[PDB]
């Protein structure tokens, strides 16, 4: 399972939303 | 190891943040607490929603990840109890049989406008458990969240 | 009140803590 990289502290809200969703999927898939 | 995504909803001032802060930090920032429920260590992630309506499409989508919903009114605020059907319908909408617990908060306060049976009528009528809580004294706070977990599973 | 990512080598626990903060942050900025 591909760990998404830290989004960067300048990330747009849309990009942070994408990262948030992908992080949950990742944390689900490694549980 | 098991995670539960819980969402706290209700009118302005009912004590959603207080309940969240009491659970997590034992005060009267973190949105996650390790608890033991019946011998199993569980993890609770809490979304503390706003009472103030912003009519936001994206706010509904963050609520959508929630597996269970504490619907909070304050026992001395009749308007906040009257608002409860709007929240239950709000919940069923964003989720499309959603796990739910009616929470009557501020049970430490003397003058109550919503009695226990009046709240429990609505609770049996919806088919959901009902817990009286106080974010101030911590009365029923663990019970409320631990019961929502039991309702999800 | 944007949370910072706790690093590419963050523990799974730390990522979960960060995820829950983001959930609330993103909800709040609407
Ligand atoms: N006596 C008493 N006061 C409470 C209790 N819970 C919350 N309050 C008080 O009620 C007020 C509002 O509480 P708060 O947690 O901010 O409610 P909220 O639902 O998160 N408000 P909002 O929807 O605007 O974010 C605060 O002054 C708080 O101290 C309680 O159980 N007992
Ligand atoms: Mg609040
Ligand atoms: Mg209410």
How does the SSE layout of this entry go?
The complex is a heterotrimer, with 2 copies of chain A and 1 copy of chain B (153 residues).
Chain A: H1 13-30
Chain B: E1 2-9, H1 16-25, E2 32-37, E3 40-48, H2 57-64, E4 68-74, H3 78-82, H4 84-95, E5 100-105, H5 116-126, E6 130-132, H6 141-152
Parallel strand pairs in B: 1-3, 1-4, 4-5, 5-6
Antiparallel strand pairs in B: 2-3
The structure holds phosphoaminophosphonic acid-guanylate ester and magnesium ion (2 copies).
GO molecular function (chain B): G protein activity; GDP binding; GMP binding; GTP binding; GTPase activity; identical protein binding; LRR domain binding; protein-containing complex binding
Enzyme class (chain B): hydrolase
Modified residues (N6-acetyllysine) (chain B): 95
Tell me about this structure.
The complex is a heterotrimer, with two copies of chain A and one copy of chain B (153 residues). Chain A is mainly alpha-helical. Chain A has one helix at 13-30. The longest helix of chain A has 18 residues, at 13-30. With 153 residues, chain B is α/β, with parallel strands linked by helices. Chain B has a single domain (1-153), classed as Rossmann fold. In chain B, 38% of the residues lie in helices and 25% in strands. Chain B has a six-stranded mixed sheet with strand order 2-3-1-4-5-6, sandwiched between helices. At the A-C interface, helix 1 of A face helix 1 of C. Chain B: GTP binds at residues 10-18, 50-51, 105-108. Chain B: Its main location: membrane. Chain B: Its EC number is 3.6.5.2. Chain B: Pfam families: Ras.
Q: Sketch the topology of chain B as an H/E string, one letter per element.
A: EHEEHEHHEHEH
Total individual domains of chain B: 1
Q: Which homologous superfamily in CATH is the superfamily of chain B?
A: P-loop containing nucleotide triphosphate hydrolases
Q: List SSEs of chain A in N-to-C order.
A: H
Name given to the CATH architecture of chain B: 3-Layer(aba) Sandwich
The kinds of small molecule bound in this structure are:
phosphoaminophosphonic acid-guanylate ester, magnesium ion
By DSSP (H or I, 4+ residues per run), the number of helices of chain A equals 1
Summarize the amount of helix of chain A as a percent range.
Answer: 55-70%
Using only CA atoms, what is the Rg of chain B? 14 Å
Shape of chain B: globular
The CATH class of chain B, by name, is: Alpha Beta
Number of strands of chain B: 6
N- to C-terminal distance of chain A: 11 Å
> Remind me, CATH topology of chain B?
Rossmann fold
Question: Regarding quaternary structure, how should these chains be classified?
Answer: heterotrimer
Largest sheet of chain A: none
- Largest sheet features of chain B: 6 strands, mixed
Helix- and strand-based class of chain A? mainly alpha
């Amino acid at each position: 399972p591909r760990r998404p990289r830290c989004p960067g502290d300048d990330a747009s809200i849309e990009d942070l939303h994408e990262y948030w969703a992908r992080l949950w999927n990742y944390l689900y898939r490694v549980a | 190891m098991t995670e539960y995504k819980l969402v706290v909803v209700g009118a302005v001032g009912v004590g959603k943040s207080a309940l969240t802060i009491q659970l997590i930090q034992n005060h009267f920032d973190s949105y996650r607490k390790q608890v033991v429920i019946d011998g199993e260590t569980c993890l609770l992630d809490i979304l503390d929603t706003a009472g103030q309506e912003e009519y936001s499409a994206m706010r509904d989508q963050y609520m959508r990840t929630g597996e269970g919903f504490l619907c909070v009114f304050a026992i001395n605020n009749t308007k906040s109890f009257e608002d409860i059907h709007h929240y239950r319908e709000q919940i069923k909408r964003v989720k499309d049989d959603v796990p739910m617990v009616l929470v009557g908060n501020k049970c430490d306060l003397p003058s109550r406008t919503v009695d226990t049976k009046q709240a429990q009528d609505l609770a049996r009528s919806y088919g959901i458990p009902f817990i009286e809580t106080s974010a101030k004294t911590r009365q029923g706070v663990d019970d409320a969240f631990y019961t929502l977990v039991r309702e999800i599973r």
